[PDB]
């Protein structure tokens, strides 16, 4: 199992990464703000906190070279929508573009709450 200290990383982000790695995410999350931009890992974490996910609305990791950014933004928007209504999260001012652009504050605000559930 990977137990290493990065050059720049708080203990909170290390706990986040270790939690998602130990929970069995399909990719290997090495950076929080560089691997969650596609919102696929967030969707994978969603069913493990008993939040149903409709995979027919999810774009697969194979992305066409045209409109891939639009597909990733759609995935982030769907993840936010799934977290809001049926999941009852407190995410004020957080949108799909924030997760797509890797906003650290709003991404940490979502992951720590995911471990809360």
């Amino acid at each position: 199992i990977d137990w290493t200290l990065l050059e720049g990383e708080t203990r909170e982000e290390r706990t986040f990464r270790n939690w998602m790695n130990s929970l069995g995410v399909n990719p290997h999350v090495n950076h929080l703000y560089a691997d969650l931009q596609d919102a696929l890992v967030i969707l994978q974490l969603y069913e493990r906190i008993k939040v149903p996910v409709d995979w027919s609305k999810v774009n697969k990791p194979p992305y066409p070279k045209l409109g891939a950014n639009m597909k990733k933004l759609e995935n982030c928007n769907y993840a936010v929508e799934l977290g809001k209504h049926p999941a009852k999260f407190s995410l004020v001012g957080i949108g799909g573009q924030d997760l797509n652009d890797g906003n650290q504050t709003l991404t940490l605000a979502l992951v720590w709450q995911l471990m809360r559930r």
């Binding site: 639009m70 933004l73 759609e74 928007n77 936010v80 407190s90 995410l91 004020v92 001012g93 957080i94 949108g95 799909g96 573009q97 924030d98 906003n103 504050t105 709003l106 940490l108 605000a109 720590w112 709450q113 809360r116």
Partner: protein, 370 residues
């Protein structure tokens, strides 16, 4: 249960945990909404911008301050702002952390009651307390006797304290602070051809404040120097690459504090305000109040403010005993530091407004418990 110390001011929001020496979250208290039209799909899902996202995308957003002159105008917005503070910035559950919030003196009671009701019925904390910003600023300085001039974004007030005893009859409140200074700066920038109207440009004007404005020790001498020479001219670069230069408005804006008539106000200067506050106190305690002048707030960050305070008060002094001005480098977070110190005290643990007291006394319990 680590107590929360959230000092939400008119301009900035200061939040953190009791025991820390510095707030963990310092973001402007703004709510941003788009004013343009989005053409592509998948991006217009966000309706409001609360934290620094409003500051970053301010070009396509309109900025509104939910707190005006230490008085709430838009109660819907603090729900968003407080949820942001609790979940995005601090990332803690309010239901487990009792939160200490601050309030300016001579604030209408409905504000405090509605704020207590909102925070209890939405965030469901175990307990609460409301402390005055000036008292916390004295807690940060480790004093029990003195007069604190708290000048933040909307409220400038003086609170004299002697041996831990306050004098409400000697406490006043001046609604002249950094926001009015920014308004004056925008008004006077049109003299050089620099026009700023949109709310986004107000942030640039506040940046010009914080990078170019200073308090003149002698106003007429600085006018003479600016009119005769050109050494006071300073250049500022706009975000789009344009460069503006100001040499006189640097000290004209902060002088509105000493000369409220600059924005057409009949009030006197802050030095005169604190002198009158001390005159409202006992003659036996005026000696200690002159020797303890503690500053706080972002408005006290102009260069030369402390020397001008000393000069003006000594001019108003009986000319026999010395004047002491205290301007710690942590003035902007003195209220938060004092709140953290107070919430960390074991004696203060019995002063919290527990939820069972609220459930039986309504929002009015804060009036008797604070």
């Amino acid at each position: 249960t680590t107590a929360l110390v959230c000092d939400n001011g008119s301009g900035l929001v200061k939040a953190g945990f009791a025991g820390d020496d510095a707030p963990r979250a310092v973001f402007p208290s703004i709510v941003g909404r788009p004013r343009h039209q989005g053409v592509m799909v998948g991006m217009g899902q966000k309706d409001s911008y609360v934290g620094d996202e409003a500051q970053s995308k301010r070009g396509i957003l309109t900025l509104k301050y939910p707190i005006e002159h230490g008085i709430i105008t838009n109660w819907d917005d603090m729900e968003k702002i407080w949820h942001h503070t609790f979940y995005n910035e601090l990332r803690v559950a309010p239901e487990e952390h009792p939160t200490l919030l601050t309030e300016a003196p001579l604030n209408p009671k409905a504000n405090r009651e509605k704020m207590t009701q909102i925070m209890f019925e939405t965030f469901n904390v175990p307990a609460m307390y409301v402390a005055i910003q000036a008292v916390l600023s004295l807690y940060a300085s480790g004093r029990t006797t003195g007069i604190v001039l708290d000048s933040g974004d909307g409220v400038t007030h003086n609170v004299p304290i002697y041996e831990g005893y306050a004098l409400p009859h000697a406490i006043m409140r001046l609604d002249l602070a950094g926001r009015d200074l920014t308004d004056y700066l925008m008004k006077i920038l049109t003299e050089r051809g620099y026009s700023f109207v949109t709310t986004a440009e107000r942030e640039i004007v506040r940046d010009i404040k914080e990078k170019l404005c200073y308090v003149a020790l002698d106003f007429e001498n600085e006018m003479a120097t600016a009119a005769s020479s050109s050494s006071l001219e300073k250049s500022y670069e706009l975000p789009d690459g344009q460069v503006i230069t100001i040499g006189n408005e640097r000290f004209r804006c902060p002088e509105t504090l000493f000369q409220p008539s600059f924005i057409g106000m009949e009030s006197a200067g802050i030095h005169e305000t604190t002198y009158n506050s001390i005159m409202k106190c006992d003659i036996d305690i005026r000696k200690d109040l002159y020797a303890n002048n503690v500053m706080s707030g972002g408005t006290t960050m102009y260069p030369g403010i402390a020397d001008r305070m000393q000069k003006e008060i000594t001019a108003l002094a009986p000319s026999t005993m010395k004047i002491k001005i205290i301007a710690p480098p942590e003035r902007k977070y003195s209220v938060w530091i004092g709140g953290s110190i107070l919430a960390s005290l074991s004696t203060f643990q019995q002063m919290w407004i527990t939820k069972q007291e609220y459930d039986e006394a309504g929002p009015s319990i804060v009036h008797r418990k604070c």
